[PDB]
Design a protein around this ligand. Structure first.
Ligand SMILES: C[C@]12CCC(=O)C[C@@H]1CC[C@@H]1[C@@H]2CC[C@]2(C)[C@@H](O)CC[C@@H]12
Lengths: 8, 242
C-alpha cells in the first residue's frame, strides 16, 4: 500500500 | 502543565492549504477534487502527528497504521470544526485558508446535509465553550475511537492507551463531571458525521470517472480498502453513550 510506504 | 499537554501542544499540526483554484467557478468536480487533495495533504500531517503522541509507539506497527486509516475522517472533521469555530466563529466551514465553504459551496458540493452537520459540530465548540486543552485531548482520543469488532493485533496495548487518554481528558477537566457527560457526548457526535462522509466518499470514488472527480493515490487506496471495512460493519466506532 501507498499508506504503509508513507508510514514505514 | 502535564508533560502530556506539553506534548499535545508541541505536536499539533499547523496550517494546510488545499491548492484550490479560487478563480474557477464552484462546481461539484472542482470542489470535491480539492477536498480530496486536502485530505491527502492532511493525511501526511496526521501520520506525523500520530507517530509523535505519547505511548503511540506502544502499539504494534500494523495497529498504528490501522488506527490512523480508520480514524482520519473523524480526526480531520473535528479539527476542521475547531478551525471553523476559531476563524469564522462557525459561520462557514474553514477546510483550509484557500477552501472556505459558504452556503453556496455547501450546496454545490452535493454534501449540504453533511456540511450542516459539520457546521453544527463547529457551533458546539461555541455553545459548550470548549477550551484549546479540551480540544487537543479530545482530538487525541478520536485516534483511539474506531477499531475492528474482532479487535486489533495487540488489543491490550490499545486498551491501555485509550484508557490513559480518557484519564487525561478527565485530568484537564479535573455538577462538573456533567462536563464529562457533555464532552463525551460531543465526541460521540463526530461518529455519525464521519459515517455519513465515509458513505459519501465511497460512492463518489465508485462513480469518480463519470463525474471527473479526482482522487489522489493514498485516498483511493484507503477509501477502497479500509473504508469498506467500516461500511461493511467489520470496523466500528467506540461510543461512550449507547
Ligand atoms: C477529510 C476532508 C478533508 C480535510 C478536512 O478539513 C475535512 C474534510 C471533511 C470532508 C472530506 C474531506 C476529504 C475528501 C472527502 C472524503 C470527499 O471525498 C468527501 C468528504 C470529504
Amino acid at each position: 500500500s501507498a499508506f504503509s510506504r508513507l508510514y514505514t | 502543565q502535564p508533560i502530556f499537554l506539553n506534548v499535545l501542544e508541541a505536536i499539533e499540526p499547523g496550517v494546510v492549504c488545499a491548492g484550490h483554484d479560487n478563480n474557477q467557478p464552484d462546481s461539484f468536480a472542482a470542489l470535491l477534487s480539492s477536498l480530496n487533495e486536502l485530505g491527502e495533504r492532511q493525511l501526511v500531517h496526521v501520520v506525523k502527528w500520530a507517530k509523535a503522541l505519547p505511548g503511540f509507539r506502544n502499539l504494534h506497527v500494523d495497529d498504528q497504521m490501522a488506527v490512523i486509516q480508520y480514524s482520519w475522517m473523524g480526526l480531520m472533521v473535528f479539527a476542521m470544526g475547531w478551525r471553523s469555530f476559531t476563524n469564522v466563529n462557525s459561520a462557514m466551514l474553514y477546510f483550509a485558508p484557500d477552501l472556505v465553504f459558504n452556503e453556496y459551496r455547501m450546496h454545490k458540493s452535493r454534501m449540504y446535509s453533511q456540511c450542516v452537520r459539520m457546521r453544527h459540530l463547529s457551533q458546539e465548540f461555541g455553545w459548550l465553550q470548549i477550551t484549546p486543552q479540551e480540544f487537543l485531548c479530545m482530538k487525541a482520543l478520536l485516534l483511539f475511537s474506531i477499531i475492528p469488532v474482532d479487535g486489533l493485533k495487540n488489543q491490550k496495548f490499545f486498551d491501555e492507551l485509550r484508557m490513559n487518554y480518557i484519564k487525561e481528558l478527565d485530568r484537564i477537566i479535573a455538577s462538573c463531571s456533567r462536563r464529562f457527560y457533555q464532552l463525551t457526548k460531543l465526541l460521540d457526535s463526530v461518529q455519525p458525521i464521519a459515517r455519513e462522509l465515509h458513505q459519501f466518499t465511497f460512492d463518489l470514488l465508485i462513480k469518480s470517472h463519470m463525474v471527473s472527480v479526482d482522487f489522489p493515490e493514498m485516498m483511493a487506496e484507503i477509501i477502497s480498502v479500509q473504508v469498506p471495512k467500516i461500511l461493511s460493519g467489520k470496523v466500528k466506532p467506540i461510543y461512550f453513550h449507547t
